[PDB]
């Protein structure tokens with residue numbers, strides 16, 4: 001089920017991330033730095049617990065979760081959210097809820113690349129990651 005997502009991934013393309021960040025209320029200076037950062041995302045499993053690390057020169061995060069079980073999360077931009085990650089149509093779908101707002105972080109594999117689609121409000125960002133050996 002989740003196995004093809006596992007490993008270490010590097011950002012190689014980003015579209016509309018500033019629009020996504022601005023929709024979330026991220027301040028201009030953080031957006032500026034974020035627009036020039038290329039994170040590494042590491043996805044690992046131990047039994048049915050997944051751990052997703054996002055590492056960069058700017059912010060680092062780490063979450064652990066069971067698919068289909070809600071968890072508390074504090075995002076890179078400091079939102080305290082209620083989250084769930086599931087597998088839907090072969091895509092790893094991460095839904096965050098806070099203050100009646102929602103955002104989705106959808107990951108799918110296309111030609112071996114990991115495409116992350118971020119949606120909040122009307123903003124839709126697509127970020128492409130490529131697998132590291």
Ligand SMILES: CCCCCCCCCCCCCC(=O)O
Nearest residue numbers: 021034039054059075076077127
């Ligand atoms: C990684 C620097 C971004 C920091 C500030 C904006 C955070 C927005 C929410 C998380 C976005 C994750 C994007 C990704 O994993 O490529």
